[PDB]
């Protein structure tokens, strides 16, 4: 069934599972034409496929050429995501294939299910959680590799860097969603907090600064304060 706060810790057991977020697959700018009509221009997208237990990220880049000559692109975006996720599973050795795939948006269920018909034992699940994975293009290295791509391309990352050397999966995922929740609500602030101190650098093979343990605690508090503030502002509480 659906994933929610009750069964939250199932994410961190030893049953292989992946999240699929499709929010950034089909990206457009909206502009005006010479005659004053509105038009869209597509930019490169990405499927965000993530193993919450291990940090492994299967960043499938969606090149704008995919859309050439296609209608109903937001609908097609869902079938393409499902197609690529299916191809990914198919490419993995059996013992690496997931037992579950959790799609962050319910509209993905029918396309994914249909594309997984060859894998009847892989459960396709929705979720009630409001996961911030649309903010993945707020991570500079991810947005960079997507926007430079000139062809379809899969880029592999560990979204947790080396955190798991020192913390559990459960705690790693909580850090990642807190960071991305803050990037979503106020990107400019969130990014300010992360780089304010030039002495803390990002390794070339990492996505996030090499904060010490004590520095991560301050960061996490600064992200929590950012998120609460933005809430009162949104709602005037």
């Amino acid at each position: 069934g659906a994933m929610n706060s009750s069964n939250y810790a199932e994410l961190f057991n030893n049953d292989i599972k992946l999240f699929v977020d499709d929010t950034n697959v089909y990206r457009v700018t909206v502009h005006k034409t010479f005659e004053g009509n509105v038009a869209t221009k597509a930019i490169n997208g990405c499927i965000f496929t993530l193993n919450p237990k291990t940090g492994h990220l299967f960043l499938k880049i969606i090149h704008t050429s995919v859309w050439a000559g296609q209608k109903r692109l937001s609908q097609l975006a869902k079938w393409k995501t499902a197609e690529e996720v299916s191809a990914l599973v198919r490419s993995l050795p059996k013992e690496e294939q997931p037992k579950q795939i959790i799609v962050t948006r319910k509209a993905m269920l029918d396309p994914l299910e249909v594309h997984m018909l060859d894998f009847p034992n892989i459960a396709i699940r929705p979720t009630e959680l409001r996961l911030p994975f649309s903010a993945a293009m707020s991570i500079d290295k991810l947005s960079d590799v997507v926007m430079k791509a000139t062809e379809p391309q899969m880029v592999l990352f560990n979204i947790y860097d080396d955190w798991l050397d020192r913390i559990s999966s459960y705690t790693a995922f909580s850090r990642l969603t807190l960071l991305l929740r803050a990037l979503k609500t106020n990107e400019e602030s969130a990014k300010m907090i992360l780089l304010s101190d030039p002495t803390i650098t990002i390794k070339s093979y990492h996505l996030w600064p090499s904060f010490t343990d004590e520095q991560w605690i301050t960061i996490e508090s600064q992200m929590r304060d950012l998120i609460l503030t933005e809430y009162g502002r949104k709602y005037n509480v």
């Binding site: 097609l76 197609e83 029918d110 249909v114 594309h115 018909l117 060859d118």
Partner: protein, 300 residues
């Protein structure tokens, strides 16, 4: 015109013959139904005054033999049987008429309703959905489950409807995932029409038998099958014109004939709102749409 005699009526029961029905009192001298129109299938059904649960009945065709009804006190129900002794059977039938203890199948001559509900229903196909091949007639009741229901117990009592499943390898060609799920024309026309059913008439006949079992016994898995078969047509972009036009007639008399009080369980809101308003064939069901709106605008 043919006759289905009844040995007796030992328990109070409402008896139906097709869309007609009569109340019969415990040990009332009821001995059968006469003037049953040759040339169609028929169904004769029952609901005991004491158990408004378990509607049951028998599909038959009088060309295939002489059938009569006899209450069994061990099993507690009216059973359909065949008399193989032709002479012994006209003897029974002629004596009960002489004594005038039989009802007349009450067909208005202007009325094509039964023909319209059974146009494509053929006894031979029915006996494949209800496999019990030592009888020439077929038993159906409220509680019988279908082959697809069982997959998700007792197969001798199953309704072997054709399994339709929109998210199956059958329905979906590889590489045409998105196409075939949005436009089921290839499932409909190649897999189901040419492959399994062979022609539109056997498909229509199963559709129609499903409906009648849902309406007369409230067989919920038949209701599911009727809806699925409607939905497969309406969700196909390419349908022979002759099927679309016949479908609109078929559905019109089914909607017309449905008891008004029963629309809530027998009509699936999603399917009809998709077929009539969202599907490829939204515009091809003009009579079924007019009658649905004037009769059940709530469901829509």
């Amino acid at each position: 015109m043919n006759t289905v005699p009844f040995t007796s009526a030992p328990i109070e029961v409402t008896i139906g013959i097709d869309q007609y029905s009569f109340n019969v009192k415990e040990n009332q001298p009821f001995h059968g139904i006469k003037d049953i129109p040759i040339g169609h299938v028929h169904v004769i059904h029952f609901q005991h005054a004491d158990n408004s649960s378990m509607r049951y009945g028998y599909w038959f065709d009088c060309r295939m033999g002489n059938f009569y009804i006899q209450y069994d006190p061990k099993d507690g129900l009216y059973k359909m049987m065949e008399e193989r002794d032709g002479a012994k059977f006209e003897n029974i039938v002629h004596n009960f008429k002489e004594r005038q203890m039989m009802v007349s199948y009450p067909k208005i001559d202007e009325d094509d309703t039964w023909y319209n509900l059974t146009e494509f229903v053929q006894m031979d196909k029915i006996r494949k959905i209800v496999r019990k091949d030592e009888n020439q007639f077929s038993y159906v009741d409220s509680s019988m489950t279908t082959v697809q229901e069982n997959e998700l117990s007792d197969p001798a009592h199953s309704l072997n409807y054709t399994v339709i499943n929109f998210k199956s390898r059958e329905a979906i060609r590889p590489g045409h995932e998105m196409e075939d799920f949005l436009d089921k024309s290839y499932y409909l026309n190649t897999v189901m029409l040419q492959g399994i059913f062979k022609n539109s008439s056997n498909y229509f006949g199963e559709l129609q038998f499903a409906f009648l079992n849902a309406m007369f016994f409230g067989n919920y898995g038949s209701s599911l099958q009727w809806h699925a078969m409607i939905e497969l047509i309406c969700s196909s972009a390419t349908v022979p014109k002759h099927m679309l036009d016949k479908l609109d007639e078929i559905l019109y008399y089914q909607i017309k004939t449905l008891p008004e009080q029963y629309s809530d369980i027998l009509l699936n809101e999603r399917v009809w709102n998709i077929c009539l308003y969202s599907s490829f064939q939204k515009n091809s069901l003009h009579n079924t749409e007019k009658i649905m709106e004037n009769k059940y605008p709530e469901l829509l």
